[PDB]
Design a protein around this ligand. Structure first.
Ligand SMILES: Nc1ncnc2c1ncn2[C@@H]1O[C@H](COP(=O)(O)OP(=O)(O)OP(=O)(O)O)[C@@H](O)[C@H]1O
Ligand SMILES: Nc1ncnc2c1ncn2[C@@H]1O[C@H](COP(=O)(O)OP(=O)(O)OP(=O)(O)O)[C@@H](O)[C@H]1O
Ligand SMILES: [Mg+2]
Ligand SMILES: [Mg+2]
Ligand SMILES: [Mg+2]
Ligand SMILES: [Mg+2]
Ligand SMILES: [Mg+2]
Ligand SMILES: [Mg+2]
Ligand SMILES: [Mg+2]
Lengths: 306, 306
């Protein structure tokens, strides 16, 4: 028999609905490519049983903690099943925006000014030190959970009083949250596939930022691929993303989000080590520009597994 | 029945023999403490079977990659067994000295000047930029694998022409290697147990550095607990270790290694998230100074598990 592949999709994160759609697309692409692939939802199926169930390899189409944060990767490593995407460390680090930012800053790479807060600090009241650091960011700011995706838990803050409500929202999702200087844009994303950096994308939301609706449920978001930069700036963006990728230790495939600010410089937002694969998703757009069918894309991601 | 605890020991890393000794001590301390503990060696026993075998919780007494680097933690998380020490991210990060250093530098914490190299770069010939960066460290330097323990693969380089052999040695143990400025010492270590920072230890090897023989097989190494610092410097050391610990995201217990340099300042070397527990080991020494039996120590570590 040829290899039986499990496409892991759904799960129980805030990105479940997106993952169900990513997995649906991946499953079809793999079967179209001649791969004996089957959908497996960890919400329904105990994933510690995959090997016992007869699977040879795993395509990870989960998003968020418990699929994308090193935990599942560790289990698959010990079970001895090859799997797509980054290993334990790089998956855990890429999920943790606070620690990605620290790593990248330690490496001399460009990141937006920011303040990190814990839920325990917020509950008690912030120090004068922290309040001064927050004030120095100016307004607006963006507030985000450290370990989410799909713009879950995020908001733009334009008044000091409402920072509290933005923090409360983000703290529903994580015990660690980031307050970041608002960047002017424009916004970009760059997909990586093995050793190939795919054509860049410029993303233009119709509203204040690339929120959940703008990502998955809007026909108003615009996309430009390649991004339409001057050749030197496209080279600058590619070199930045490659250094960010290598600094985190990522492998296989992924997507790094970047924005310009008013100073004309690129800033790193985050890396994603199990990117969206839906009809609205960005890695498929870059791959299409690179002359790949969606089927060719997913077969390639699978071939790259250990 | 009351809970059956698996003490994981041995495994297949370069630190196997240390781990067999750590686990032997932990097993006895747990049983003296009234805990129904059993030794389980992942070299002999399929660790994916622990829950099936009837275990309720796991005491990790493994050292090195595959017990200490987040992989096993991920498996245990998905199996649903509580386990001792740090989670997936902090274990993976603490094992990766290169990425710990970047994280800590990003956070403004003191780390020795260094250069990181990959094995592929070394095989081809280093760039002029890399050669210039190595020269700027001066001599002597220490060379270490990124992801080892127990001083495995490490050497001091006092002459330019001996750097290549030191690099070749370290590259036997990891594909990523660090060249670091030689620090004058003295050398310290600080153990963390839950929220408690234990009494500091000053370590005085008889030779060039605290090598494998000095760690595990010598009656010549000297230890001072507490470290014998002035009150203000002891406070400084504790504050630095606590910030390093929290920046990594570690939990449960662990030990951070620190050295003075000739400027009189402390520099962070690394964190260890599954510390040695042998008769030569440091966490037990700190615990004894804090008025605990070894049995009380390991019972507390186990109580702290998820
Ligand atoms: N500092 C900032 N200033 C302005 N806009 C921002 C900033 N940070 C993030 N954004 C906006 O918020 C969106 C989501 O932020 P980010 O990519 O950091 O987190 P995410 O929720 O993990 O996204 P993903 O779906 O890619 O996983 C960005 O695509 C961008 O539109
Ligand atoms: N930059 C340096 N200068 C001088 N000595 C050093 C330096 N870095 C490390 N050492 C020496 O080498 C020893 C081991 O280094 P380090 O703690 O970084 O790695 P390790 O192999 O993971 O140790 P462990 O058994 O604690 O896990 C230190 O205890 C110290 O004696
Ligand atoms: Mg994301
Ligand atoms: Mg209010
Ligand atoms: Mg639609
Ligand atoms: Mg994003
Ligand atoms: Mg170590
Ligand atoms: Mg002895
Ligand atoms: Mg050490």
């Amino acid at each position: 028999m040829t290899d039986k592949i499990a496409v892991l999709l759904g799960g129980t994160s805030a990105e479940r609905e997106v993952s169900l759609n990513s997995g649906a697309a991946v499953l079809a692409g793999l079967r179209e490519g001649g791969i004996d692939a089957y959908p497996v939802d960890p919400k329904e199926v105990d994933v510690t049983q995959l090997k016992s169930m007869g699977f040879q390899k795993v395509f990870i189409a989960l998003h968020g903690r418990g699929g994308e944060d090193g935990t599942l990767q560790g289990m698959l490593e010990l079970m001895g099943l090859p799997y797509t995407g980054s290993g334990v460390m790089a998956s855990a680090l890429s999920m943790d925006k606070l620690r990605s930012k620290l790593l990248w800053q330690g490496a001399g790479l460009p990141v937006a000014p920011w303040v990190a807060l814990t839920r325990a600090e917020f509950e008690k009241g912030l120090s004068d030190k922290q309040l001064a650091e927050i004030s120095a960011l100016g307004l607006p700011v963006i507030v985000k959970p450290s370990r989410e995706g799909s713009s879950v838990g995020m908001s733009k803050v334009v008044a000091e009083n409402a920072l509290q409500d933005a923090l409360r929202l983000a703290f529903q999702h994580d015990e660690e949250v980031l307050i970041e200087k608002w960047l002017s844009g424009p916004e970009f994303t760059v997909a990586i596939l093995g050793e190939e950096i795919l054509p860049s994308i410029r993303i233009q939301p119709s509203g204040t930022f690339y929120d959940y609706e703008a990502k998955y449920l809007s026909d108003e978001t615009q996309y430009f691929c390649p991004a339409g930069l001057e050749a030197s700036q496209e080279a600058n963006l590619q070199a930045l993303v490659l250094k960010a990728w290598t600094t985190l230790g990522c492998k296989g495939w992924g997507r790094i989000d970047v924005m310009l600010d008013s100073d004309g410089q690129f800033y790193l937002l985050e890396a994603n080590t199990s990117p969206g694969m839906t009809s609205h998703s960005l890695v498929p757009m870059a791959a299409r520009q690179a002359g790949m069918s969606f089927s060719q894309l997913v077969v390639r991601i699978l071939e790259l597994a250990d």
